[PDB]
């Protein structure tokens, strides 16, 4: 089992496909909090821009990734 | 364990993925991906389209380049989407040869530079020199100069300065460890 499909769909321009991916990510972080870190800057850029519309969800996920690693500061 | 995963396409798709990883010149992941395959699937399907990436990767490790080249050329009877890797992989192979043969010998007759790198034409040979920043002097390549200079320049960076260890620095550390 692997989070790499999820990572890959996010790049696609289409908003409908990226949003559905976030929701999938949120339920595999538990374990996959490792593979996802390599690609974590993409998840960050989608929140930082106001362009995105599912912003709150994108930050939430980046936090969960920092929490499991234990890099608490960024998580909060 | 098996759903309807087994397909003719299954074998074909694996083959391609591995060729890709070789074309990226990222052997790290190639072997990683190979280790994943090495159980159930590789054993049950034998190697019949797998034999194309296994053997390619294997002869390049072995050091026998002649063998690694012939697989690339014989690829012709099977192309359908494989050429998209064939091209990238070749160009990297000539580079590989050129690097091994750099230290071996500085000056080679014109005929031998071509033959080694398996170029069809002499003009293509001199194209690769210019890109590689090597003087052609009397239709003989010279590898020694630039490569050494470059090497020297590369050696000086903000990484490898703390890993050198100065002889005076070694002394200090030995002395103070006793005296702590």
């Amino acid at each position: 089992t692997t989070a790499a499909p999820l990572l890959a769909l996010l790049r696609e321009n289409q908003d409908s496909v990226k949003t559905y991916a976030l929701e999938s990510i949120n339920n595999v972080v538990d374990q996959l909090w490792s593979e996802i870190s390599n690609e974590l800057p993409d998840i960050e850029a989608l929140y930082d821009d106001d362009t995105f519309s599912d912003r709150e969800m994108a930050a939430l996920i980046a936090s969960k990734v920092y929490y499991n690693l234990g890099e608490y500061e960024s998580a909060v | 364990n098996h759903k309807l995963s087994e397909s003719d396409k299954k074998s074909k798709l694996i083959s391609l993925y591995l060729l890709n990883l070789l074309s990226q010149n990222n052997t790290t992941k190639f072997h990683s991906e190979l280790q994943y395959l090495d159980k159930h699937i590789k054993n049950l399907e034998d190697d019949s389209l797998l034999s194309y990436p296994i053997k390619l990767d294997r002869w390049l490790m072995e050091g026998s380049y002649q063998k690694a080249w012939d697989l690339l050329q014989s690829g012709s009877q099977n192309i359908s989407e494989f050429d998209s890797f064939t091209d990238i992989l070749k160009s990297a192979i000539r580079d590989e040869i050129a690097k091994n043969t750099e230290l071996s010998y500085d000056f080679l007759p014109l005929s031998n530079i071509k033959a080694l790198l398996f170029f069809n034409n002499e003009k293509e040979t001199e194209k690769f020199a210019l890109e590689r920043n090597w003087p052609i002097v009397n239709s003989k390549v010279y590898f020694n100069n630039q490569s050494k200079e470059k090497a020297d320049y590369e050696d000086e960076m903000m990484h490898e300065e703390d890993q050198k260890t100065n002889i005076i620095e070694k002394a200090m550390d030995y002395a103070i460890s006793i005296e702590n």
Binding site: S34 | T28, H31, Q35, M61, G63, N100, L103, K170
Partner: protein
């Protein structure tokens, strides 16, 4: 017959139980319950063989049953039920004493004494299950109860010390079920297995209990390894918090074993050395531990051959693990002599033994090495050797082929030569002498730094014992 033996068993357990019950309830004497719990586990396992092993049945019968009862009934169901005194509470001989547990207060719910007793009871059950070879239903049932049983409670430093054993059996038992038989269910539950371990680890970072962290990380590596998921292991290791300081030396040796394995396959050999040498010394030489040692020596043989070293023959000469290590030994030989035709025969014949241990994949890769060692040999011997002679001897395909081996070999600089195409020979260039170089400094740096570290360890250790006896009464 039944009665006497059953009774003695119950007493023995009760004695043990009482000791640790007094211990655990007083401040931070942590080390004491921990040493005691370990010894105990061993004593219990050794016990089972004679004077029955229905200690478990007894031991349930005379304690408060929170869910113990449900498990016991399942276990009886499994080996065909009987009833003779096998429902807990059938002998009231606690009698509201504090030691055998204040019967009323456990019921009132003002206090809880059952908590730590239930963790300890799960350990004892688990050990018996594996010793026995009670698979299928029990194994599933045990796992199903214990995971939510632990997530029902809230951990303490003392509870943390206990689950450091429990999590080993949750893993091990599942593996046994894959190892019986292939099920479609085994593929699903493999995933669930990883998931529960992963969660408990996150929390346990927050408890700052090293014991459990270390245990857990070893279990987690072993699973990734079976599925050959190196990419996912590589990120996993970069987490970096796997403690060493507090941990028992066993956990350091399983951890290092795994490190050697994962590094070697992804084409790193240099660092893989440090880890396998370390993992052999840390392992003990115990009689039950001989099985581990063979396995470590198989892997070592491989690591070295890839790197370009020759494991001493001498080391394997006086070993007794002989019959198992026959395949490996012949590989060493093939490399050492550079003999091309031998090599191939060796890996075809032994293929199946080599596949089990998964050393095999490493063994294909030594094919590059056979050739290289054989070129190393010709160079040491000969200062000018026509390339034409090398082409006949190693039965190489064409004049172009013989060049390419030497070309690539000098890139790692193993041979260090120079090829003359036109003059049609190789001339050795090998420095040989490196005393003159700066190199001697570097070698000695490692020697000295290791030495200094040993003095520090000694100082710190020496004073501690002496304080303990000086406080104690003496002449």
């Amino acid at each position: 017959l039944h009665h006497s033996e059953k009774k003695y068993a119950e007493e023995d357990q009760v004695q043990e139980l009482l000791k640790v019950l007094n211990e655990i309830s007083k401040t931070t004497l942590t080390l004491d319950p921990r040493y005691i719990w370990r010894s105990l586990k061993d004593l219990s396992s050794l016990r089972n063989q004679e004077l029955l092993n229905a200690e478990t049945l007894c031991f349930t019968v005379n304690v408060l049953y929170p869910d113990s009862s449900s498990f016991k009934k399942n276990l009886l169901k499994f080996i065909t039920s009987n009833h003779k005194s096998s429902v807990p509470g059938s002998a009231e001989l606690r009698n509201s004493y504090p030691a055998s547990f204040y019967s009323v207060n456990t019921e009132k719910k003002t206090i809880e004494v059952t908590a730590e007793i239930n963790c300890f009871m799960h350990l004892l059950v688990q050990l018996f299950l594996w010793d026995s070879k009670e698979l299928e239903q029990l194994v599933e049932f045990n796992r199903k109860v214990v995971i939510p049983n632990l997530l029902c409670y809230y951990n303490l430093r003392s509870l943390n010390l206990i689950n450091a054993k429990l999590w080993f059996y949750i893993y091990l038992s599942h593996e046994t079920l894959a190892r019986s038989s292939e099920e479609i269910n085994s593929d699903n539950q493999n995933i669930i297995l990883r998931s529960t371990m992963m969660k408990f680890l996150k929390i346990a970072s927050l408890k700052h209990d090293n014991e459990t962290k270390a245990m857990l990380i070893n279990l987690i590596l072993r699973d990734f390894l079976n599925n050959g998921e190196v990419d996912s292991a590589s990120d996993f290791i970069s987490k970096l918090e796997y403690p060493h300081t507090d941990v028992s030396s066993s956990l350091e040796a399983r951890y290092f074993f795994y490190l050697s394995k994962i590094n070697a396959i992804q084409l790193d050999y240099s660092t893989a050395n440090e880890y396998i040498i370390a993992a052999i010394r840390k392992a003990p030489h115990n009689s039950k531990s001989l099985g581990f040692l063979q396995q470590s020596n198989k892997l070592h043989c491989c690591i070295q051959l890839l790197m370009g070293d020759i494991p001493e023959l001498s080391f394997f000469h006086q070993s007794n693990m002989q019959k198992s290590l026959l395949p490996y030994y012949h590989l060493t030989k093939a490399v050492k002599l550079g003999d091309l035709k031998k090599f191939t025969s060796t890996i075809t014949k032994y293929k199946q033994l080599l596949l089990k241990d998964d050393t095999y994949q490493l063994c294909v890769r030594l094919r590059s090495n056979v050739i290289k060692t054989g070129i190393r040999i010709i160079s040491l011997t000969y200062k000018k050797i026509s390339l034409r002679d090398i082409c006949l001897k190693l039965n190489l395909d064409s004049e172009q082929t013989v060049e390419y081996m030497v070309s690539r070999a000098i890139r790692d600089g193993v041979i260090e030569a120079k090829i003359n195409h036109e003059d049609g020979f190789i001339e050795t260039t090998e420095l040989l002498n490196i005393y003159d170089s700066e190199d001697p400094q570097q070698v000695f740096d490692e020697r000295i730094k290791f030495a200094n570290q040993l003095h520090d360890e000694y100082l710190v250790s020496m004073r501690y014992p002496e304080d303990k006896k000086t406080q104690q009464n003496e002449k």
